[PDB]
Amino acid sequence: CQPHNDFEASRAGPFAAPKVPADITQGVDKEANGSVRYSYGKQHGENWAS
Amino acid sequence: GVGVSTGSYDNQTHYRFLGDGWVEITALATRLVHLNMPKSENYCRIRVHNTTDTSVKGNMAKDDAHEQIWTPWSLVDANAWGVWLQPSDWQYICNTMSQLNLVSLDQEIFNVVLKTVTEQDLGGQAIKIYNADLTACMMVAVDSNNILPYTPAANSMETLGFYPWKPTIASPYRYYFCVDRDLSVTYENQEGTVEHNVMGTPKGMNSQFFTIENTQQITLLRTGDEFATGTYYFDTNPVKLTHTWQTNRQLGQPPLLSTFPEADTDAGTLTAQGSRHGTTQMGVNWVSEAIRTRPAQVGFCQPHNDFEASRAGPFAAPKVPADITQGVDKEANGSVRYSYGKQHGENWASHGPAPERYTWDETSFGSGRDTKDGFIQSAPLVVPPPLNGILTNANPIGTKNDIHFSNVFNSYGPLTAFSHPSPVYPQGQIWDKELDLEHKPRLHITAPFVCKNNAPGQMLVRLGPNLTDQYDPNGATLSRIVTYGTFFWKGKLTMRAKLRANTTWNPVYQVSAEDNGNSYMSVTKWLPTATGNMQSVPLITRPVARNTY
Amino acid sequence: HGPAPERYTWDETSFGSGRDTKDGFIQSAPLVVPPPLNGILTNANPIGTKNDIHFSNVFNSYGPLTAFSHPSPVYPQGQIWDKELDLEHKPRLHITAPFV
Amino acid sequence: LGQPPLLSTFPEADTDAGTLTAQGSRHGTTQMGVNWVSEAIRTRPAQVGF
Amino acid sequence: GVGVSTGSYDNQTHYRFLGDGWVEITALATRLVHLNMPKSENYCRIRVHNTTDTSVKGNMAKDDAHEQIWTPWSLVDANAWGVWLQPSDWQYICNTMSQLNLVSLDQEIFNVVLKTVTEQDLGGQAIKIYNADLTACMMVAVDSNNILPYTPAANSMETLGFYPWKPTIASPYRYYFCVDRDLSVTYENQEGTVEHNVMGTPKGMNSQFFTIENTQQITLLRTGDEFATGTYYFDTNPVKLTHTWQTNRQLGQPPLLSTFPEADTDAGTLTAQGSRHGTTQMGVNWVSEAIRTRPAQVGFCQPHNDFEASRAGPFAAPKVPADITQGVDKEANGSVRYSYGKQHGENWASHGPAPERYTWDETSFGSGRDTKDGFIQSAPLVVPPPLNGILTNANPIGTKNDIHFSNVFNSYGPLTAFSHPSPVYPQGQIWDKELDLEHKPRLHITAPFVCKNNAPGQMLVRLGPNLTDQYDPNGATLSRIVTYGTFFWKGKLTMRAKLRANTTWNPVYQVSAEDNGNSYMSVTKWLPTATGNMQSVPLITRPVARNTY
Amino acid sequence: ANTTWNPVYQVSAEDNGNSYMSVTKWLPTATGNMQSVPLITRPVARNTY
Amino acid sequence: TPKGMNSQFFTIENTQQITLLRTGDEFATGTYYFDTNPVKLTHTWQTNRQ
C-alpha cells in the first residue's frame, strides 16, 4: 500500500512524492497505483493532422 | 631496568599528497592518562531505577530504568574527531577534500608510572605525601575480538582529552544487562496513578555476564615496560564532505521558457500548464513543477517523536537527521543536540554543573522536510482542494489537536534517497561496530563510519591491586593500599581522502574565522584567555556545494 | 483420534526487536516533560472513528535504521529452504523459511 | 547499547541500588532541543525492531 | 634489573577440535597470591588432643586426636576443578563430552613483590606505612619427587581462589606424625567414665620427620626474578562423564510378552512363571525378574557407618558413593557432604563463621542401594517367606533395635561392578597420589583421577626471613622485620576429552539455567549482586544418559 | 564458545511431569503412539553489541 | 514414571545401516575376532586342607 497523493514539502517547495507504479486491478485505481500519464508533441509522436 | 622512558610524544598531523587527487592524511595524537584504583573490587550488578520522574504521570521520557554491570576496569576509547586532528586542520580538510575514509589505527602505552599516597601530619594538619612505587604495575587488555559489549565513548561523551597539553582520565567500563522493565502511558494528569512501573529480574535466556579476566589476555606492565597494538585496518566506506541543495523540485530538464526578462527585475514565464509536454502521475490534463514525475524521492517524512516501547522499556525511535529548511523544524528533522563537559570542549571559565549544549543541523538541503507545508489530497486529484479532500498539518488526527499525520507518517519508500550525517569535529563519533543482526541498518546515526568487517576493539585498562600486609577474603577485609597511575597514550589514525576541484564559476562557501566579534566564527572562540581558559566549538562540515544530479 | 489437528503458536526469541502496544505512544513536536492531554497519542485514542483502531494497528516504523534478526526455524514442520521471487527487488528475507 | 550512564551512588546493601547524574546537567546526546537527557531520549546507533 | 614485570595474565579456556570425536581442552588460570611471614620460625611438633568431646561418653566420632608437624612453609596447591575452568565451561563439557582425562600441567611465578610495613603515628594514632623492599626475596620449591607427605589442598578445603579477579592466600603446609592414640567405646551414658583415652609418644620405628630445607632445591627469587616448572604429564585414566540407569534388574533379554496393551492405560503380561524358559540359581521350578541370573552384580551392600579402630585411633571406614534411590538413604550410600568457605565458593554476603555445606548424591542409578527393601531368606528358598525364614531390615541383630544386617554387611564380591564418583566442579579434587602399598585400592573417593605413575609434586613456598639489625639465636631473640609477599601464579592444565553422539530418539537430560526463581539452576546463583557478592554452587555432573549393556 | 561466567540457558528434558520439556513427550506409549513437539531454538544468549 | 536423566530410547532405524535384500539377494558379515581369555576344561579337587 502506497500513500495516495502524499504531497511533501521541503525548502524547495511542495511536491508530489513519487510512487512505484503497479497494476490497477479491478479497483480501477489509476492515480492510486501510480499509473503515470504522459504528454508528448507532434515531433514526438502526435498526429500531425491534429 | 626501570628509570627510563619507553616512548615518544607526538600530536601532529602530516599530509602526504599521493597525487591523482588523493592524499593520505596521518593523524598522530598523544595524551597523558590518569587512572585511579577502582572502588569496585569486583563486578557489580547495580540496578538503577529512578522514580523521582517515572512515578509522575506527566514524565514519561525521563525513564532511566535499566540494570548495568559496573566492572572494575576503565577504558581508553579515543573515538572522537577532536581527540585526533587539530582545530585548524579540520578547516583545511572540509574546505579542500570532498571525501574521507578511515584506513589504519595504532596505539601505544609508554612511561607507565605508579605511585602511592600516604598521610603525614604537618603542624597538626595532614598533608598527603606521594612516593613512587616501582614494584607497582598496571594491567592492559585490547579486546580485538569484541567478545565484550561494545561501549562507544562518544555515546556517553566520556572520551579522552581534546587538549594535548592537558591530562585526561579514562572512563570506567560498564555494559547493560537483561532486565524486563515496563512502564504504562500517562498524559499530564490521567485518572489515577501510573498503572505499571517496575524493574525486572535476571532471565536465563538473556543473562549476559562477561569478565575482562576471561575475555582477553591481560598484559602486565610496570614502570619500565611498555605496550603497543598491531596496525588495525578499517573496511568502512568513505563519507562525502559536501552538502546537497537540489530538492525533489529540481532534477531533470526545467520547463521551457516562453518569456525572457527584459529587466533584471521581472522574470520569465513557462508554457500553457494545460498544453505542455511532460510526465505527471496524475490522470489530469495538466502539469506543473509540483506534479511532474521525478527519478526518485529526495528525503522522506519521518514520524515525529515516535516513542516505541519494548521488553526493555519505552524509548525514542531514532531518525535520520536532515535539513531543517524554512520550517525551522529541528526536533522534527532529527537535529541531534549534544552536551559535553570542560575536558571535552566547554570553556574552563564557565564554573558550574551545567555543561554546554548545541543543536546540530544537517546540511542536506535536499532531503529537508517542512511540517508547515506537508499535505495530502483525495484520490480524485482536482485543482480545487475540497475542504474534506485534503489533509493539512492542522487536522486533529486521533481526537488530538496536536497530533497530526506528520507526527505519525513514514514516507520511507523504494525511492527514498538521502545523504549521510555530517560528522562534527568536537565530540564527534568516528567509527562504530555493526549490529550482530541478519539485516543491519543501512547506516548509523551515532557515527558516519561503520566497520563492515570486525570492530577495532575497545582498549581496557586497570591498575594492579596493591594488597596490604594483612588480608582475608572470608572476613570481607579487602585492605588495599591507596595507589594510582599515570600512563601516556600514543595513537596514529591514518586515513586517505580525495579533494574536489573548482568546477564552478561562482566561489563556493568556505569556512573562515572572522575577527573578534558577535560572529560565530570568531577567533577568540578558539583562542586562550588571560587566565588560560579555552573552548572547542563545532565546525562547519561540508562547506563546499555538491550537485546531486 | 479426531479431525482436529494439533496447533501451537511460535514466539520469537529476539527479545531485542520486541514490541509492546501497551506502551507505544507519540508526542507533539514541541517535546516537553509534561505530556499534554492533546500533546500525545497513546494506544487508547480512537483514530478513525473507531475505539479499537489505534495508531499501532496502522503504523509502519520501518526505516533506514531498522535492524532485526531472522525467524527461528522450528524442528517440527519447519520449512528449510525456499525459492526466491522472480522480481527486480525481492524481499530482504522470507518468513516461510530462514534459508533462501 | 552504548556506554551506560555514570553511577554517582554505589549500593551499600544488596537491596538498594545506585543513582545517575543530574538529568539536566549530564553529558550525552539527545535528538531533542531540550536541556536534559535520559535512558529514553539518548540517541542510539540504530533502531532495534520496528 | 628490577622494575619490570616477568609474566602475563591469562585465565581462559581454549577448545582445539582434534577431530575424530576427540578434543584437546587447555585450561589456563592465573591468580594473585598473598603470603605472610610464617609465625613458626622453625618446625614445630604441636600435639592437638581435644577433650571437650572425647571425654564425653556419647561423643566418639568427634575424635580429633592427632599430632601433626607444622612447617614454616605455605603451599600453592590448586587441585580444584573450580580453580581451573570457568562456571559456564563445565556446562558445555558435561553436556557434550562423554569422557575426560588429564594430560599435562605447567606453572609459573611472575611479578614477585615483597614489601615491609612500619608503624607511623598520625595525629596521635598509628597508621601502617607500606614501603617496597627490593633487596627482599622469597623462596620457592617444587618437590616433584614427592619425598614429603602428600597433602591434598581439597582434603582440607584450602586450595587457591576460584575467583580470577580476587586474590588468594596460600594454605600452610603440615603433615601427620607417628602417635599411638587409643579410645575406648562408650554409648550414651555407659557405666563409668571412658576407660582409655590418651595420646602417644614418638616411636623410633615410625618417626617421620622431614625438612623442606633438605628435601628440595629451594630457588631464591627477588622482585625482578621469576620461576617456572616443566611440563608434567599425567598417566591417569579417563573418567566417564555419564550416569548409569540400568540396575541388576534389567540386563539381558526381557521376558516374552504374551499380552499386548489394547489401551495406553493397561499393560501387557508375561508367560507362566512356572512354565517359562530362563535361568535361575534356585532349585525351584519357576522364574521371575527377581530370581533370574545376571551377567554380574550391579552395586553392592556396604557396611553403614563401620567405624574401625587402629593404632592411630577410631575412624570412619570409607565407602564408595552411589545412587540414593527411593530409599533416600544418603549416609547409607556414602553421599559425601562438603563444607567450603567464601574464598572457595560461599556467598560473600553471608557474614558469619558458618560455612556453606551440601550433600553430593551420585548419579549411578544402577548401583543404588535401598535399606528399606534389603532382605535374605533361608537356604530352602520357598515362595511363602516364613517368619523365621527371612531377615528383613527390622530384625534386631546383636541385641540392638537399630543395628541390623544392612549396617554390617559387605556384599563386595567377584561380581561387584560399579562406576566412578562424579567429580564436582566447585571444591572438587582432580588428581591424587597413589598409596605406597603392594595392593593399592581399585580407586580413590577423594579424586576421580589417580596418578598411576609418579605424582605431580606439591609446590611449596616461603618468604625469605628479613633479619633485623640485632640478632642472637642463643638469646632466643629472633627479631624479624615485618614483611609479606604477593606473587602471581600462572598454570595451564591441558587435558583431552571425547564427546558422545546422539544415538537416541528421545532428547537426553541437559544442564540449563532457568530464570531467576526458586529453581536450583537459577542464573542469579552465578550472577553478581548490587554490592558485588558472588557464590559458586555445584553443577550437575554426568547429565547425559549412558547404557550399561 | 563459553565467553561468559554465568551458565547460559540450555535445552534439557525434565522428568515426566507438567514440565513442557517432559521426556514422555517424545517417548512411545503402551500402544506405540508418539508425538513430535517443537523445540527451543536459539537457547544460547547472544550479545548484539 | 519416565525420568529425564535415565530416559534411554533407541531406534533400530537410527542406530544401524539397514541392508534391504530380496529373494535374489544375500548378506554376510565380516570376520569378527574375540579377545576373550581361554577357559580351563578341568575341575579342582584340592581344598584349603591339602
Residue numbers in the entry:
A (entry chain A): 339 to 388
B (entry chain A), E (entry chain A): 39 to 587
C (entry chain A): 389 to 488
D (entry chain A): 289 to 338
F (entry chain A): 539 to 587
G (entry chain A): 239 to 288
Q: What did the study's authors say about this model?
A:
We have been using the parvovirus minute virus of mice (MVM) as a model for studies on virus biomechanics. The virion 41 is built from a self-assembled T = 1 icosahedral capsid, 43 into which the single-stranded (ss) DNA viral genome is later packaged. The capsid is made of 60 protein subunits (VPs) with identical sequence and fold, except for their N-terminal segments (Nts). Pores (channels) at the capsid 5-fold symmetry (S5) axes are involved in DNA encapsidation, uncoating, and biologically relevant translocation of VP2 and VP1 Nts in the virion.
We have now determined the crystal structure at 3.8 Å resolution of the mutant N170A VP2-only capsid, and compared it with the crystal structure of the non-mutated VP2-only capsid (strain p). The N170A MVMp capsid crystallized in the rhombohedral space group R32. In the virion, the Nts have been externalized through the pores and, accordingly, electron density corresponding to the glycine tract is found inside the pores. For the N170A mutant capsid no density was observed within the pores, which indicates that the disordered VP2 Nts are not constitutively externalized. The structures of N170A and wt capsids are very similar but not identical. The root mean square deviation (RMSD) was 0.58 Å for equivalent Cα atoms in both structures (1.08 Å for all atoms in the 549 VP2 residues superimposed). In the ring of five N170/D171 residues located near the base of the β-cylinder that surrounds each capsid pore, the N170 amide group can form a hydrogen-bond with the carboxylic group of D171 of the neighboring VP2 subunit. This interprotein interaction cannot occur in the N170A capsid structure. In addition, removal of the amide groups of the five N170 residues generated five cavities around the pore walls. However, the free aperture of the pore at the tightest constriction formed by the ring of L172 residues immediately below the N170/D171 ring remained nearly unchanged, with a diameter of 7.9 Å in the N170A capsid compared to 8.2 Å in the wt capsid. The results reveal that the capsid-stiffening, cavity-creating N170A mutation neither modifies the diameter of the pore nor induces any dramatic conformational change around the pores; instead, it generates subtle rearrangements that propagate through the whole capsid, resulting in a more compact, less flexible structure.
